[PDB]
Amino acid sequence: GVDISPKQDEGVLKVIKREGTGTEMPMIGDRVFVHYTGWLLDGTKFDSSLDRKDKFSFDLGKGEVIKAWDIAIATMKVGEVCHITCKPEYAYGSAGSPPKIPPNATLVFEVELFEFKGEDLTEEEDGGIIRRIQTRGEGYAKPNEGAIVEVALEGYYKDKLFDQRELRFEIGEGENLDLPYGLERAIQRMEKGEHSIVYLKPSYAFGSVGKEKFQIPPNAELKYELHLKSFEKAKES
């Protein structure tokens, strides 16, 4: 196996069994759909999703799964089947996970990646604002309502560029600068230095009105490539 731990301490080793298709790999925030089987190092099978109904689903890089999985899934293409070997530091450590996993145990997983999709950022979870992070930001803070943000943006409608600007503005005042409401909501979910692509359904963009001077008709879906360059948070109550 190839060492894929960022510290290169052989914590996570990976063998590709079947090559996947295309070019894209899931990023932090993405929802991932897999089948897996898990073994102890001596060969004891402790679990499999194939014994259950549907695929196993989780949100990547949000700490829902053991560290080995966050690290390994981020390297897989759709259709790929791989085997990963995970040291205890990258799985369950001293604690173990009784009754299945004993203390200080090395694990082997067979994982097949079926699909992944961007993170739904809407309060209603209706798919109207979808984010695909390209490169994660450098800080943990995020802009709030009333924050002054510095952003670089490119807006596309049917893959044609209609807006390209670097802007300094107050969150909550974007409408006056011809920014759609869904975009301002997305920026409040970004970290300093983050590079991402945001997809907006019409209800979260310019809706039934459109935006005539950008040549955007009623009921248009939009795509923005965004950099959050810096921000100062506003005071809250």
Ligand X SMILES: C=CC[C@@H]1/C=C(\C)C[C@H](C)C[C@H](OC)[C@H]2O[C@@](O)(C(=O)C(=O)N3CCCC[C@H]3C(=O)O[C@H](/C(C)=C/[C@@H]3CC[C@@H](O)[C@H](OC)C3)[C@H](C)[C@@H](O)CC1=O)[C@H](C)C[C@@H]2OC
Which residues are marked as active site? 36, 46-47, 66, 92, 109
Residues from 35 through 54 that contact ligand X (CB under 6 A): 36, 38, 46-47
Classify 227 in phi/psi space as left (phi over 0), alpha (psi -120 to 50) or beta: beta
Near ligand X in 9-38, by CB under 6 A: 36, 38
Q: Under the criterion CB under 6 A, does residue 64 sit at the interface with ligand X?
A: yes
- 62 contributes a contact to ligand X by CB under 6 A: no
Q: Given candidates 27, 66, 73, 183, which one binds ligand X under the rule CB under 6 A?
A: 66
Residue 137 CA to residue 193 CA, distance in Å, equals: 4
Q: Which of 56, 156, 169, 214 binds ligand X (CB under 6 A)?
A: 56
Length of the chain, please? Answer: 237
Query: Do 151 and 166 contact (CB within 8 A), yes or no?
Result: yes
Query: In Å, what is the CA distance from 100 to each residue of 34, 97, 152, 201?
Result: 21, 6, 49, 44
Contacting residue, 32, 65, 190, 198, with ligand X by CB under 6 A: 65
Sign of the alpha-carbon torsion through 158, 162, 167, 170: negative
Residue number, 9 or 126, with CB nearest to ligand X:
9
Question: For binding to ligand X (CB under 6 A), which residues are involved?
Answer: 36, 38, 46-47, 56, 64-66, 69, 92, 97, 100-101
